[PDB]
Amino acid sequence: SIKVECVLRENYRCGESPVWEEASQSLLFVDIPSKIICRWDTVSNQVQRVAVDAPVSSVALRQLGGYVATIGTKFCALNWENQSVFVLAMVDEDKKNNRFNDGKVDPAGRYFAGTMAEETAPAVLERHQGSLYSLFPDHSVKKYFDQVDISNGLDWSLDHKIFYYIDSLSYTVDAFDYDLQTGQISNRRIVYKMEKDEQIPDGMCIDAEGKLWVACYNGGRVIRLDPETGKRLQTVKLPVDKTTSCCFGGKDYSEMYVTCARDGLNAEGLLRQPDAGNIFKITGLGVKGIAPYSYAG
Ligand SMILES: OC[C@H]1OC[C@H](O)[C@@H](O)[C@@H]1O
Ligand SMILES: OC[C@H]1OC[C@H](O)[C@@H](O)[C@@H]1O
Ligand SMILES: OC[C@H]1OC[C@H](O)[C@@H](O)[C@@H]1O
Ligand SMILES: OC[C@H]1OC[C@H](O)[C@@H](O)[C@@H]1O
Ligand SMILES: [Ca+2]
Secondary structure, three states, rough: OOOEEEEOOOOOOEEEEEEOOOOOOOEEEHHHOEEEEEEOOOOEEEEEEEOOOEEEEEEEEEOOOOOOEEEOOOOOOOOOOOEEEEEEEEEOOOOEEEEEEEEEEEOOOOEEEEEEOOOOOOOOOOOOOOEEEEEOOOOOOOEEEEEEEEEEEEEOOOOEEEEEEHHHHHOOEEEEEEEEOEEEEEEEEEEEEEEHHOOOEHHHHHHHEEEEEEEEOOOOOEEOOOOOOOOEEEEEEEEEEEEEEEEEEHHHOOOEEEEEEEOOHHHHHHOOOOOOOEEEEEEOOOOOEEEOOOOOO
């Protein structure tokens, strides 16, 4: 029943931030070092790209039209019709060598995204240089906490009272109390401790049953976690090791899309993993996900 299929063979260097746009039946994502925001029309099977001038680490839908994205250390807005990209807000202005990493829109339309020191190789970087931010609908930015190694996967409970969060080099999935009307968070705690063979926790999405799916970078898998118990429910393996993120999409959010990377693989690794950097689809998981929220500014 569970089927893993490589569905887009474009060999991205580090595919990240998959988000399903049901209005266009398209998958949006980024290829970070390639400095492109990608939109894959799954019907026509055509990919369109917007080139940007710095590494781009996440993309989200913008409610009023178009898209938003994290490029370098700037929150940016994109009009797809004119390919125009402009800055909404900047962060980490006191940092020499930082960039945004993962980001996602909360259930009130705020664009959460966190930063990291820039890497020279995978997970080789200055420690604790990142912070978590959110871009509010009025374009102001809230700073939540600092000392982040690599800001990564994040999502919100279905009752909108819990915020789930991954700093990759903590090797844990954490939770906070979260207030929907204000976007405030409180009382960080560990919810899941990654096993050795699960490697580095990367991207994460919630499903319609309130369980969490986490992409395991270097672990060649996604895992399903119960945040209520702190236990793993399921593991699904993929034929690429550097699985970076996941989201639900397609008909009624019943299909999972998984991004991955070829950056960091040596000659032998590339040969063992011919689909490194491609987009995968997983069907038959037996759960559906939920629609992404759109940025409200
Ligand atoms: O550290 C290697 C990779 O780990 C996963 C991060 O999301 C990505 O930005 C980073 O480049
Ligand atoms: O001051 C009370 C208010 O504090 C903020 C909460 O989001 C709101 O629901 C509550 O009513
Ligand atoms: O959302 C389900 C659970 O997720 C983990 C949180 O630490 C816990 O407080 C919450 O009840
Ligand atoms: O309520 C503000 C915003 O919250 C996110 C929703 O996806 C968007 O439609 C809404 O406009
Ligand atoms: Ca990531």
